[PDB]
Amino acid sequence: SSHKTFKIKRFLAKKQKQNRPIPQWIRMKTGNKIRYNSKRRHWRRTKLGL
Amino acid sequence: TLARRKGRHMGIGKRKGTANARMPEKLSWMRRMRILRRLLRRYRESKKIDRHMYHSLYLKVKGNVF
Amino acid sequence: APRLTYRRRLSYNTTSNKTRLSRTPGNRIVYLYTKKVGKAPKSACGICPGRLRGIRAVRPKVLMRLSKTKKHVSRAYGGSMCAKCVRDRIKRAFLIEEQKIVVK
Amino acid sequence: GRGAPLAKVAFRDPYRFKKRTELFVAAEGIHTGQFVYCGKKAQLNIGNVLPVGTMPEGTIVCCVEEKPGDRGKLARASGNYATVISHNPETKKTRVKLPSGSKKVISSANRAIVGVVAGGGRIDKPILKAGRAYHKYKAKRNCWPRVRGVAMNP
Amino acid sequence: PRKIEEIKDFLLTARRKDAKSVKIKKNKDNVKFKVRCSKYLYTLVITDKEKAEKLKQSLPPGLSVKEL
Amino acid sequence: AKRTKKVGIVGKYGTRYGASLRKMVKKIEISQHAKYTCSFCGKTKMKRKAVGIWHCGSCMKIVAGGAWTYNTTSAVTVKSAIRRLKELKDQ
RNA sequence: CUUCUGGACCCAAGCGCCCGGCGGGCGCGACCCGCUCCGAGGACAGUGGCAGGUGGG
RNA sequence: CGGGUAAACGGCAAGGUAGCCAAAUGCCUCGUCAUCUAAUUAGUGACGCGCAUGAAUGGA
RNA sequence: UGGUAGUAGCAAAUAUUCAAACGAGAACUUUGAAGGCCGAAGUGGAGAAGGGUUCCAUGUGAACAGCAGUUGAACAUGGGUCAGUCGGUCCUAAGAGAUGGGCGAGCGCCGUUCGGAAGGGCGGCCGAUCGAAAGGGAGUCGGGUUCAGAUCCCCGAACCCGGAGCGGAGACGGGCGUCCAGUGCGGCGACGCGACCGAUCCCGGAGAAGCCGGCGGGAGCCCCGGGGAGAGUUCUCUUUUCUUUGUGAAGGGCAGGGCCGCCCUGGAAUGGGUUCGCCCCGAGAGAGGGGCCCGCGCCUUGGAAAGCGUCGCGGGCGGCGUCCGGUGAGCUCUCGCUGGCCCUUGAAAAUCCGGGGGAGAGGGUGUAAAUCUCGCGCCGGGCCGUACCCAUAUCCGCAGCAGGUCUCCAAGGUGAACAGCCUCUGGCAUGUUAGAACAAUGUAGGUAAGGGAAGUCGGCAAGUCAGAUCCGUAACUUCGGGAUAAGGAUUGGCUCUAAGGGCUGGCAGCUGACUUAGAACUGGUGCGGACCAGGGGAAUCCGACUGUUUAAUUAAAACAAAGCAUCGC
RNA sequence: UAUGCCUGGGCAGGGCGAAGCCAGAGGAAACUCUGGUGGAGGUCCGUAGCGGUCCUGACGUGCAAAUCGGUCGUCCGACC
Ligand SMILES: [Mg+2]
Ligand SMILES: [Mg+2]
Ligand SMILES: [Mg+2]
Ligand SMILES: [Mg+2]
Ligand SMILES: [Mg+2]
Ligand SMILES: [Mg+2]
Ligand SMILES: [Mg+2]
Ligand SMILES: [Mg+2]
Ligand SMILES: [Mg+2]
Ligand SMILES: [Mg+2]
Ligand SMILES: [Mg+2]
Ligand SMILES: [Mg+2]
Ligand SMILES: [Mg+2]
Ligand SMILES: [Mg+2]
Ligand SMILES: [Mg+2]
Ligand SMILES: [Mg+2]
Ligand SMILES: [Mg+2]
Ligand SMILES: [Mg+2]
Ligand SMILES: [Mg+2]
Ligand SMILES: [Mg+2]
Ligand SMILES: [Mg+2]
Ligand SMILES: [Mg+2]
Ligand SMILES: [Mg+2]
Ligand SMILES: [Mg+2]
Ligand SMILES: [Mg+2]
Ligand SMILES: [Mg+2]
Ligand SMILES: [Mg+2]
Ligand SMILES: [Mg+2]
Ligand SMILES: [Mg+2]
Ligand SMILES: [Mg+2]
Ligand SMILES: [Mg+2]
Ligand SMILES: [Mg+2]
Ligand SMILES: [Mg+2]
Ligand SMILES: [Zn+2]
Ligand SMILES: [Zn+2]
């Protein structure tokens, strides 16, 4: 909704910044095992609820 | 709307609402009251009729006389 | 017929969500939100059903920025009591105060 | 909620410059602008609040105090009243007849409003619709549609 | 906006300390002198064009004048 | 002028609630909506505002009377009884 | 010490006494004394603990 | 133990009164009669010792 | 991981086609054209709850979008939500919940006044606090600007609250230098004038009060006659058809509306005034003359400089136009008047104001106290929310799910109609695919000769009837009804006739716009021509009725119901 | 979702037409009759809305773990 509280909007800010893909220079490190960001969330498939 | 203004397209076979729906009876009575009461108020102010014949005709106008 | 919309997020026809149609200098019919119809003060007697005369019929907080002459009349009980019950109370106060002298 | 009207009687505070407004059970016959009087030396008129001991026998009163000073408990419904049967100056106890037919011996200091509670004859009108009975209890409480126990389950 | 009816009252408004500027609008039937004060836009409507130059030259010096 | 034969004011209920019940409310629906003469002003403007409340549209007098009539028979009998008890109490 | 009315009603008038350099204070007015605020109950209602009856709630 | 109480449960201690019915209630039963149709286990109106109707377990 | 099996299926809501462009690649994208749909209770334009970056730009075509895709609500990279006056914030609504007190083994619970409860300026309060983005609640609108924001930015014109410079008011002078006044003033009155002292205390008002009927005013929209400016048509006709033809808040003035709720004069029966209805009057009509409130209307400051239309020229310069009218049971909105209904009477509080009272304050002859934005000037207005979707693809239902989810604005024609049908503004591409064919069997729609329920548990399904007008309407009844009972006739088009108004001048002139009735003519007897749209009657059973009920197999004779009666206190 | 409470929102067009009122008639009188007006109601047809009768229709590994179509109930009230 347009009528947001500060805590909810701040909560949506953190979840929006975490939705980035993994930078490709991480995959070139020594003991790298991460192929891709497995915690990606889509707005239509997984709802936050909070 | 010019042909209907001359009476065309308004026969019996063109009516679908009740006569009271097309022209309300309460409206036709209200139009007649304001017409007849304005006539008596103009005749009383023009001294054509006195306040005693006016008040008598006012109650006869309120009845279905004229 | 240009259909117009609300200008605020309140989309319900509540008592505070009242509007009127206004023509802008740009030849546009827009919604202009109206203010509630204020009522003139009522008589303090509690008998006369009519409102007081000579006082603006505006909202309560609007009376804060109105001049005192626009909220009362030059009579004794003006702005609070109607002129009719003032004349009655002037007579009732005198006639009762005279009877309390006759009983003595 | 109640079928009897209530009167907004105004009094003067005997100790402060204050207008005391009370809410009585309107006796039948009173009107706005009437001067009603409360006390033991007030006259016997409809609407006045008198002790049940300072009144003649057979006096029709309403809003009778069950205990001395309870501000009126008995005969406060529309169209009801209590009759002062007899007195007893030795024990200072009056015997009153309640609207249910029972005769109760109360103290002679219990104040009461002389007259009958207004709104009488309300039950004499047959409620014709179920909707009229709905609105009757819609202001009282949630008890009107009474399912029979024989219509329920064990 | 407050409309001024007299020429004398217009000079008292243009001579104020909060008078920022005075605009001169030459219309078809009149000429308007709109002085911008702190709160209200005072306007004097002069009908005849003869009193336009009479009032234009009588404005206090230092007040910003603009022709529209 | 005579639109109905016997129902009159209770013709609004149609064929509902029974003949006896529509006849009992007829005596009450008439007395409830009837305008009475104001004993304080004289104008016939006493109308029932609520149950047991009767208001005059001219002198603005509010009188607490009966539920369906301006005054019940049990009230005028008590008023005359209290007056008779008051005079016998003073002497 | 208030019953004729849809009024008004307080923040002492007055007297006595006293202090300041025109003001202020006290008393009477507004009696004194006193142990429960005023009434209705009352060692009964009631409370806790045992005992009997009743109890498809 | 005794009294009252059935618009209390109920029954008809009392022996089903007024009513009603082969009924949404009749086992025998597709009862009998009339009517309704060329033909009716249906329908209706009647008849009622009614297997097992019936009066605020409300009758009509 | 198989057979099933390249099978079921990719079938609800009419529909696409042509050309071109980009591109390796086009039934699906984009532009243009044509043909259609939604048809203003929209497939339109904006919100609330919810979602949370889905919004916007560019790029990718790998996975996803059940065909494809050059496309996307996908993916990747950047960007985007600007407020004193919009809401939150403030108030208490039902409520919820501390303190005292009580209880409880105990976490705690009960409880919302009930205890030395006033932390203010002589004090009454009686109950801290929480609880509404639909209640209460001061005050911003117009134009312009973005790829996405807008009553928030920009420009212009204001307003409100809080806080400490001018002018004006108070201030009117008399009597003999002196003495003495002066906390305004007008009107018979309603009441007026730009202010016009005053506290504790007191009183009152506004906030702040249902639903329904009818009427009138104002506006927006629609409609009609013109005049401009563009455009369509121009085979024939058409001075034609279509589009567009305006002025915010705030201030002032004036129409208009309301005072059966006010004022003065006066006095009423031959009673009068008056409405659609009512209603009103010796507690004072009618009449005349006033006063007040509302004036969202018009004019005007704003203000045309801007906006718009059109013609040009080079973020702009210009020309020209933005006009004159007339109607209404029209449609919405809003303001009034007035009545009806209730065994229904249809909120509180914050906040703001008026009055009563006159404790006090102010200066001694020109001022002082004081001044309700009186009129101006100066300063400040913090915090949070603000993008977008708001639903046959942005919410919920496992999904782009034929379900579900609260509203606001509402064009023309037909018609009684916000019915159905057609069109304009706006929107869309037929609802998760296409091509070909037109077998059976289906689902949906329709017709059928002759007979007319012989079908079947059963007229199930289907059909008949249907609108309006003029007629005619029984048994029975609680007298209300039954009833649109039943049974009949008429219905088009065109051409006339008659009847129903208003304004102006004292009958005359001018001007309507909505209908009814009658008649003639006319036709392949067709005419509520589509659409919309009751089959009826005679009885029995049950329930009085309206209402309610097993969400997802039972809408009933069940429950409820008024009435009746009993029982307790 | 069941129910009470609080605060809001919403509910075309028509039919029959109740009390009150006006007038004209009839009558020796009591009183009656007619026309109009008025717009009552858990009124009627009916849109939105809310319901969900019948087809025991469609679907029935469905659009849907209850939906769709026609038909149908009610639609100022115990309404939504
Ligand atoms: Mg979802
Ligand atoms: Mg009528
Ligand atoms: Mg059961
Ligand atoms: Mg057991
Ligand atoms: Mg027998
Ligand atoms: Mg047969
Ligand atoms: Mg039989
Ligand atoms: Mg019996
Ligand atoms: Mg996008
Ligand atoms: Mg993109
Ligand atoms: Mg695909
Ligand atoms: Mg993404
Ligand atoms: Mg709060
Ligand atoms: Mg609000
Ligand atoms: Mg936007
Ligand atoms: Mg004073
Ligand atoms: Mg200020
Ligand atoms: Mg937005
Ligand atoms: Mg879809
Ligand atoms: Mg299709
Ligand atoms: Mg055939
Ligand atoms: Mg057969
Ligand atoms: Mg059928
Ligand atoms: Mg029949
Ligand atoms: Mg029988
Ligand atoms: Mg029933
Ligand atoms: Mg079911
Ligand atoms: Mg019927
Ligand atoms: Mg419907
Ligand atoms: Mg269905
Ligand atoms: Mg089926
Ligand atoms: Mg199948
Ligand atoms: Mg029906
Ligand atoms: Zn008054
Ligand atoms: Zn009176």
DSSP string covering chain F, please?
Answer: ----SS-GGGGGGTT-S-HHHHHHHHHHHHHHH--B--TTT-SS-EEEEETTEEEETTT--EEE--SSSSS-HHHHHHHHHHHHHHHHHH-
Q: How far apart are CA C9 and CA C27, in angstroms?
A: 24
Return the residue of F nearest to D129 by Cα: F17
Residue with tokens 């209530």: D6
Q: Report whether F67 contacts D121 (CB < 8 A).
A: yes
Going from the Cα of E53 to the center of ligand 17, the distance in angstroms, rounded, reads 38
Residue with tokens 């539920």: F67
Q: Nearest CA to D125 among F44, F36, F10?
A: F10
CA C46 to chain centroid, in Å, comes to: 16
Q: Report whether F51 contacts F41 (CB < 8 A).
A: no
Q: How far apart are CA D51 and CA C67, in angstroms?
A: 54
Binding residues of F for Zn(2+): 38, 56, 59
Residue type, D90: E
Q: How far apart are CA E43 and CA E31, in angstroms?
A: 10
Pairing between β-strand D93-97 and β-strand D82-86 as defined by DSSP bridges: antiparallel
Q: Which nucleotides of I are covered by protein (CB under 7 A)?
A: 40, 44-54, 73-77, 86-87, 133-144, 151, 156-161, 184-187, 189-197, 201-209, 214-216, 219-222, 224, 244-251, 259, 261-263, 270-278, 280-281, 283, 291-297, 300-308, 329, 333-336, 339-345, 350-357, 372-374, 376-378, 384-390, 394-396, 399-400, 406-411, 413-417, 467-470, 478-481, 490-498, 500-502, 513-518, 527-529, 532, 544-547, 558-564, 569
Q: How far apart are CA F9 and CA F32, in angstroms?
A: 11
* Nucleotide nearest residue E19, measured CA to C1': I377
Tokens at residue D129, please? Answer: 């619709």
C66: helix, strand or coil: coil
- SS3 sequence, D60-106? EEECECCCCCCCCCECCCCCCCEEEEECCCCCCEEEEECCCCCEEEE
Residue type, C77: Y
Question: Interface partners of B (3+ CB pairs, < 8 Å)?
Answer: none
Give the H/E segment covering residue E46.
Answer: strand E41-46
CA dihedral of E27, E29, E35, E36, whole degrees rounded to 10:
-50
Q: How far apart are CA B6 and CA B9, in angstroms?
A: 9
Q: Which residue is nearest to nucleotide I124 (CA to C1')?
A: D16
CA A26 to chain centroid, in Å, comes to: 17
- Sign (positive or negative) of CA dihedral F87, F89, F90, F91: positive
State the nearest Cα–Cα gap between F1 and chain D, in angstroms.
Answer: 28
Q: Report whether E3 contacts E45 (CB < 8 A).
A: yes
The count of CB pairs under 8 A between chains C and F is 3
Name every residue whose Cβ is closer than 8 Å to that of residue F88 and which is 6 or more positions away in sequence.
D56
Return the residue of F nearest to C49 by Cα: F60
Residue F67 with chain D: CB contacts under 8 Å: 3, 78-79, 119-122, 124-125
Q: Report whether E23 contacts E34 (CB < 8 A).
A: yes
Residue F60 with chain C: CB contacts under 8 Å: 47-49
C11 touches strand J (CB under 7 A): no
Q: Report whether F52 contacts D78 (CB < 8 A).
A: yes
Q: Do chains A and D touch (3 or more CB pairs under 8 A)?
A: no
Return the residue of F nearest to C46 by Cα: F60
Residue with tokens 């029974």: F18
F 35-54: CB under 8 A from C: none
Structure solved using which method?
A: cryo-EM
Question: What Cα–Cα distance (Å) separates residue A34 from each residue in A14, A29, D91?
Answer: 22, 10, 101
Vertex D83, ends D78 and D84: CA angle to 5°? Answer: 145
Residue type, E13: T
Do D44 and F82 count as a contact with CB atoms less than 8 A apart? yes
Going from the Cα of E43 to the center of ligand 5, the distance in angstroms, rounded, reads 109
The resolution of the experimental structure, rounded to one decimal in Å, is: 2.4
Tokens at residue E66, please? Answer: 């603009």
State the nearest Cα–Cα gap between D49 and chain F, in angstroms.
Answer: 14
D67 touches strand G (CB under 7 A): yes
Select from F60, F67, F78 the Cβ nearest to the Cβ of D119. Answer: F67
Residue with tokens 């309140």: C10
Q: Which residue is nearest to nucleotide I283 (CA to C1')?
A: F41
